[PDB]
Design an enzyme around this catalytic site. Structure first.
Site, PDB file in Angstrom:
ATOM      1  N   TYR A  31       3.651  47.207  58.982  1.00 56.45           N
ATOM      2  CA  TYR A  31       4.263  45.909  59.242  1.00 56.45           C
ATOM      3  C   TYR A  31       5.771  46.015  59.118  1.00 56.45           C
ATOM      4  CZ  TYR A  31      -0.234  43.480  59.045  1.00 56.45           C
ATOM      5  OH  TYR A  31      -1.529  43.083  59.296  1.00 56.45           O
ATOM      6  N   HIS A  74      -0.413  40.750  67.563  1.00 61.35           N
ATOM      7  CA  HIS A  74      -0.372  39.309  67.322  1.00 61.35           C
ATOM      8  C   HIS A  74       0.982  38.771  67.774  1.00 61.35           C
ATOM      9  CE1 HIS A  74      -4.095  38.797  64.884  1.00 61.35           C
ATOM     10  NE2 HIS A  74      -3.931  40.098  64.730  1.00 61.35           N
TER      11      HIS A  74
HETATM   12  C1  HEM Z   1      -4.616  49.335  59.846  1.00 64.06           C
HETATM   13  C2  HEM Z   1      -4.633  48.654  60.980  1.00 64.06           C
HETATM   14  C3  HEM Z   1      -3.767  47.468  61.289  1.00 64.06           C
HETATM   15  C4  HEM Z   1      -2.558  47.535  61.858  1.00 64.06           C
HETATM   16  C5  HEM Z   1      -1.829  48.808  62.299  1.00 64.06           C
HETATM   17  C6  HEM Z   1      -2.072  46.190  61.968  1.00 64.06           C
HETATM   18  C7  HEM Z   1      -0.844  45.918  62.494  1.00 64.06           C
HETATM   19  C8  HEM Z   1      -0.309  44.685  62.630  1.00 64.06           C
HETATM   20  C9  HEM Z   1       0.977  44.440  63.158  1.00 64.06           C
HETATM   21  C10 HEM Z   1       1.982  45.494  63.654  1.00 64.06           C
HETATM   22  C11 HEM Z   1       1.160  43.111  63.140  1.00 64.06           C
HETATM   23  C12 HEM Z   1       2.436  42.419  63.610  1.00 64.06           C
HETATM   24  C13 HEM Z   1       3.285  42.382  62.263  1.00 64.06           C
HETATM   25  C14 HEM Z   1       4.670  41.767  62.297  1.00 64.06           C
HETATM   26  O1  HEM Z   1       5.494  42.107  63.076  1.00 64.06           O
HETATM   27  O2  HEM Z   1       4.984  40.835  61.423  1.00 64.06           O
HETATM   28  C15 HEM Z   1      -0.043  42.505  62.602  1.00 64.06           C
HETATM   29  C16 HEM Z   1      -0.268  41.151  62.443  1.00 64.06           C
HETATM   30  C17 HEM Z   1      -1.417  40.589  61.919  1.00 64.06           C
HETATM   31  N1  HEM Z   1      -2.482  41.296  61.466  1.00 64.06           N
HETATM   32 FE1  HEM Z   1      -2.740  43.264  61.440  1.00 64.06          FE
HETATM   33  N2  HEM Z   1      -2.946  45.264  61.493  1.00 64.06           N
HETATM   34  C18 HEM Z   1      -4.009  45.976  61.048  1.00 64.06           C
HETATM   35  C19 HEM Z   1      -5.135  45.422  60.460  1.00 64.06           C
HETATM   36  C20 HEM Z   1      -5.370  44.083  60.245  1.00 64.06           C
HETATM   37  C21 HEM Z   1      -6.554  43.537  59.627  1.00 64.06           C
HETATM   38  C22 HEM Z   1      -7.749  44.317  59.084  1.00 64.06           C
HETATM   39  C23 HEM Z   1      -6.422  42.174  59.615  1.00 64.06           C
HETATM   40  C24 HEM Z   1      -7.440  41.194  59.063  1.00 64.06           C
HETATM   41  C25 HEM Z   1      -7.201  40.340  58.074  1.00 64.06           C
HETATM   42  C26 HEM Z   1      -5.127  41.895  60.237  1.00 64.06           C
HETATM   43  C27 HEM Z   1      -4.600  40.655  60.442  1.00 64.06           C
HETATM   44  C28 HEM Z   1      -3.364  40.387  61.021  1.00 64.06           C
HETATM   45  C29 HEM Z   1      -2.864  39.001  61.219  1.00 64.06           C
HETATM   46  C30 HEM Z   1      -3.595  37.712  60.858  1.00 64.06           C
HETATM   47  C31 HEM Z   1      -1.675  39.097  61.767  1.00 64.06           C
HETATM   48  C32 HEM Z   1      -0.804  37.893  62.153  1.00 64.06           C
HETATM   49  C33 HEM Z   1       0.577  37.829  61.508  1.00 64.06           C
HETATM   50  C34 HEM Z   1       1.347  36.606  61.982  1.00 64.06           C
HETATM   51  O3  HEM Z   1       0.886  35.796  62.766  1.00 64.06           O
HETATM   52  O4  HEM Z   1       2.572  36.422  61.535  1.00 64.06           O
HETATM   53  N3  HEM Z   1      -4.501  43.074  60.597  1.00 64.06           N
HETATM   54  N4  HEM Z   1      -0.957  43.495  62.258  1.00 64.06           N
END
Ligand code: HEM
Length: 301
Positions: free
Chosen positions: A291, A25
């Protein structure tokens, strides 16, 4: 076992983990708004932001890709994240993206998928030896497609929290719910055709234009667990149709005071508050850790 570092590695292997960007993202924009719950929400949870008062809301609309230069017009998951500021200054987040259910029920499953998704060697091959390991995915295409549609606007599609959260009210009653952020605007998408011709960042431009026309609204809905709905498997479809609106997010414009200097903005699904607890969901619990890793990679640079 599986470590955060490893998760980041798999992510980087897909084009993510870019410098100074969220591992995933990477491409996203911040917006200002407020949130006000319905009069009845306080019967479901004792959370301060659900009592009926109006609280500050910071929203981030993003593309799921780890590539900051990802093309809005190309297929992909979009994410909507809301950060609520409570009376005492503390905050609690709600994270949601365009997919109806999670592709995997465990962190390992998700990560194994991000590896076999890596380009090079045998992409279409290894991205199959997975199907053999995870049957469940063979009937996924239908949902996967829906979760990758090209929305005409970030304001014309809905987002889902996937994980089940336990909501406790002042009376001690509790219930599990899944989050859903639906638009008040008509849902609307573009065909692959139109999507191709669009500007790389048309979604950013349209939303800026939409807000100059007036506020954008999303109703916060909770789907309350039925007698056989899993509270630990975010890939499992729920039978319950007891979905209720407990509040509305009113977005009025793009934010400009946030993320300047050493200021960090992260929407952690585990950042709950009094009246809201996380479920024994293995994916939900692993996120907060992966995260922290991601937030670290972008804090320094
Ligand atoms: C276990 C597997 C997952 C991993 C490894 C993962 C990893 C990540 C990472 C690395 C980020 C960037 C975080 C940052 O630097 O602040 C992120 C953002 C995000 N993830 Fe995931 N994620 C996973 C599952 C999910 C799931 C299931 C959802 C559904 C609700 C989700 C929704 C989001 C959203 C909405 C963002 C946006 C954050 C923003 O815009 O500031 N993620 N995720």
């Amino acid at each position: 076992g599986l470590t955060p570092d490893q998760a980041i590695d798999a992510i980087r292997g897909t084009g993510g983990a870019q410098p100074g960007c969220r591992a995933l993202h990477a491409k996203g924009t911040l917006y200002r708004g407020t949130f006000t719950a319905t009069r009845d929400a306080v019967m479901l949870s004792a959370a301060p932001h659900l009592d009926g008062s109006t609280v500050p809301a910071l929203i981030r609309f993003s593309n799921g890709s780890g590539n900051p230069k990802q093309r809005d017009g190309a297929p992909g998951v979009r994410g909507m994240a809301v950060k609520f500021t409570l009376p005492d200054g503390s905050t609690t987040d709600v994270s949601a993206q365009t997919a109806r259910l999670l592709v995997s029920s465990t962190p390992e499953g998700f990560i194994d998928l991000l590896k076999a998704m890596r380009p090079g060697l045998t992409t279409p091959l290894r991205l199959a030896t997975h199907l053999l390991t995870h049957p469940r995915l063979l009937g996924a295409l239908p949902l996967l497609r829906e979760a990758n549609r090209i929305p005409a606007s970030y304001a014309t599609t809905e987002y889902h929290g996937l994980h089940a959260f336990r909501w406790i009210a002042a009376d001690g009653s509790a219930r599990f719910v899944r989050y859903h952020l639906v638009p008040t605007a008509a849902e609307e998408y573009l065909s692959a055709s139109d999507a191709r011709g669009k500007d790389p960042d048309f979604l950013t431009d349209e939303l800026a234009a939409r807000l100059q026309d007036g506020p954008v609204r999303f109703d916060f809905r909770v789907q309350i667990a039925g007698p056989t709905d899993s509270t630990v498997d975010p890939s499992s479809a729920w039978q319950s149709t007891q979905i209720v609106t407990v509040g509305t997010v009113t977005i009025t414009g793009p934010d400009t005071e946030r993320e300047h200097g050493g200021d960090i903005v992260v929407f952690d699904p585990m950042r709950v508050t009094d009246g809201i607890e996380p479920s024994d969901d293995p994916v939900l619990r692993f996120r907060t850790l992966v995260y922290s890793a991601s937030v670290k990679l972008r804090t320094g640079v």
